[PDB]
């Protein structure tokens, strides 16, 4: 568990982090520990950041994880669904709803900013897909952000 935490903090290599978290989850489940929920939530976060949210459902429904269904699994599942739908508003709703879960965990809090940036990027792409000369004001209205922020992000993306 600690090895995965360290090799997910800032290393920018998430496959090995997920492997380590899976090992930790198996270990804690074997002895019926109360931290298996933490291991499951951290590996779900690893998958989300690896940008394959579709596997979150499979991980949660996996045979070993049924007894661990609950608030934390639901929170991370909702975050994964928000990422899949490419909805920054959905992500913000998930945060403001399950704040106790996704904002009191130090590691999840550490990665929240990067997840927010990635979701903003993908949301802008999805919003501007069916356009050729869309207006920045319209994009800002669609994505519920300020015009200046949207313009700056689009400039960075073009760069």
């Amino acid at each position: 568990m600690q090895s995965g935490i360290i090799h997910a903090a800032e290393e920018k290599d998430w496959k090995t982090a997920y492997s380590y978290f899976y090992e930790a989850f198996e270990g804690y489940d074997s002895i019926d520990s109360p931290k298996a929920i933490t291991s499951l939530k951290y590996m779900l976060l690893c998958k989300i950041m690896l940008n394959t949210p579709e596997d979150v459902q499979a991980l949660v429904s996996g045979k070993l994880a049924l007894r661990y269904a609950g608030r934390q699994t639901e929170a991370l599942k909702c975050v994964a669904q928000a990422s899949k739908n490419r909805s920054l508003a959905d992500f913000e709703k998930a945060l403001t709803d399950y704040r106790a879960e996704l904002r009191d965990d130090p590691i999840i809090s550490t990665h929240l900013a990067k997840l927010y940036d990635n979701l903003l990027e993908q949301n802008l792409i999805r919003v501007i897909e069916p356009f050729s000369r869309v207006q920045i004001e319209h994009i800002s209205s669609l994505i519920k952000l300020s015009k200046a922020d949207v313009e700056r992000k689009l400039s960075q993306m073009i760069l």
């Binding site: 429904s61 897909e129 069916p130 356009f131 050729s132 000369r133 869309v134 207006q135």
Partner: protein
């Protein structure tokens, strides 16, 4: 190796006489000794007879504790004969069928299951006992427990059981899972059934039950094409075809769901095949709706609701309606989906014809506001159903892809090739005409 047929025949009636007189304990001791001797000698028939007779004697005494203890002991007896245990379990299953009291039935069934757990020779008996226990639990009012109990079984592997019984067990598991609201498990279970089974001799009721369960499962989340396929399979059954009302309802559902299904190659092929049916005449309005959705011309939601609004929703006594568009929330959702289908069809047609259109005109022709039409078109483009580019500043929707010089030159080359082929064909026709009209 050493037969005991004469000895068993001579002894059993005397044991029965003593048992009915009230000599239960002594008779059971003596029969246990005889069973030990028969098992040692490896006399299958003698051991089976002794076991069945002992169970019957214990049953016709209302000695339930004695029956349970005897069954367990005689099952656990060392080097017991599998055939003897099977015969005893069959007789005990008959007894469990006959018995009526609830807790007594439960305890006997539990003991039989514990005895026959994990044994190839007695596996159909265990499956039937589990089915009966699940039925009893459901009737008592534990649907979740009944579903769990019946799902614990694995019927696709029992090679001795007949295909009819296996299919019945699978269908019961599907029904219980649907009643407990476990759709992933229901789909996993339903995967077991091989559709080729419902063709051999009598797979009519089973076929109908399976297809109805599949219809429910798919309709849970919306699988209109698969629902239409299931309804076609139902409509194909001779039992449904014989009665006019049943096949009429089946065809109505098929047409309606094929209409509701989103557009794709498979959907188009299914729609064409359904339209190419003679029986549709008896359902005139639905045939008109199918023709409306197959013709490549704009259609209006208001006109559709005016013409077919009541026939497909409330119905008339001559042709009854269907639960496709009922007054429930499912029906409301399906009505909304039909409206979305109409909008998508209009967009597809106005993309087949039209290089550039204005957003105001597209909204005016789709009968929606500009914002709603923009959202619909954007969703279609994102999902990749149709190609479109919105120039919001000018309010123009471009349906033509960019034209590369390679594409332009290829089009020109194709035109030239077609021209040459047409010249050759014209020359052939001219030669034929000259031959026909020149000799005379």
């Amino acid at each position: 190796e050493v037969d005991y047929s004469a000895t068993v025949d001579q002894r059993l009636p005397e044991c029965a006489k003593l048992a009915k007189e009230g000599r239960l304990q002594e008779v059971i001791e003596t029969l246990l000794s005889l069973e030990k001797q028969t098992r040692t000698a490896s006399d299958m028939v003698s051991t089976s007879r002794i076991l069945v007779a002992v169970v019957k004697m214990c049953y016709e005494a209302k000695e339930w504790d004695l029956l349970n203890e005897n069954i367990m002991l005689l099952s656990k007896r060392r080097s017991q004969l599998k055939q003897a245990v099977a015969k005893m379990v069959q007789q005990c299953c008959t007894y469990v069928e006959e018995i009526t009291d609830l807790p007594i039935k439960l305890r006997l069934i539990d003991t039989l299951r514990m005895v026959t757990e994990g044994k190839i020779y007695v596996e159909i008996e265990r499956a039937r006992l589990t089915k009966t226990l699940a039925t009893i639990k459901e009737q008592n009012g534990d649907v979740k427990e009944a579903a769990s109990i019946l799902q614990e079984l694995q019927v696709e592997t029992y090679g001795s059981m007949e295909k009819k019984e296996r299919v019945e067990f699978i269908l019961e598991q599907m029904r219980l899972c649907l009643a407990v609201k476990d759709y992933i498990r229901t789909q996993i279970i339903s995967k077991k059934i091989n559709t080729k089974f419902f063709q051999e001799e009598n797979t009519e009721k089973l076929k109908l039950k399976y297809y109805n369960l599949m219809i429910q499962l798919d309709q849970h989340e919306g699988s209109y094409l698969s629902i239409c396929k299931h309804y076609r399979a139902i409509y194909d059954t001779p039992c449904i075809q014989a009665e006019s009302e049943k096949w009429q309802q089946a065809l109505k559902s098929v047409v309606l769901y094929v209409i509701l299904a989103p557009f794709d190659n498979e959907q188009s092929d299914l729609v064409h095949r359904i339209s190419g049916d003679k029986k549709l005449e008896e359902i005139p309005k639905y045939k008109d709706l199918l023709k409306l959705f197959t013709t490549m011309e704009l259609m209006r939601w208001s006109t559709l609701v005016e013409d077919y609004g009541m026939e497909l929703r409330k119905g008339s006594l001559e042709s009854p309606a269907t639960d496709v568009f009922g007054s429930t929330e499912e029906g409301e959702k399906r009505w909304k989906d039909l409206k979305n289908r109409v909008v998508e069809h209009n967009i597809r047609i106005m993309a087949k014809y039209y290089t550039r259109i204005t957003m105001k005109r597209m909204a005016q022709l789709l009968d929606l506001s500009v914002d709603e039409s923009e959202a619909f078109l954007s969703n279609l483009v994102v999902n990749k159903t149709i190609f479109a580019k919105v120039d919001r500043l000018a309010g123009i929707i471009n349906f033509q892809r960019p034209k590369d010089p390679n594409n332009l030159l290829n089009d020109w080359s194709q035109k030239l090739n077609s021209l040459m082929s047409l010249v050759n064909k014209t020359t052939h026709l001219i030669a034929k005409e000259e031959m026909i009209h020149n000799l005379q």
